[PDB]
Amino acid sequence: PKSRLFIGNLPLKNVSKEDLFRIFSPYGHIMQINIKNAFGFIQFDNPQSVRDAIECESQEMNFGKKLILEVSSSNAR
């Protein structure tokens, strides 16, 4: 299957493939990283694992917006 993962404007402090790697890598069947120097994208296999990784890593306490991750479950390439 196919899925893509969008990062919010948090990593506007310089960023590397390794920032999105630390976020998501031990999830799903994987595909590729498309890091961009303002905020990156990921494109991975298994969208349900990408969505389970959002609620794992982007988990939030009542202290405002500290993490922003969003799935686009486009099963198309």
Added chain:
RNA sequence: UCUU
């Protein structure tokens, strides 16, 4: 929060 949808792509130097």
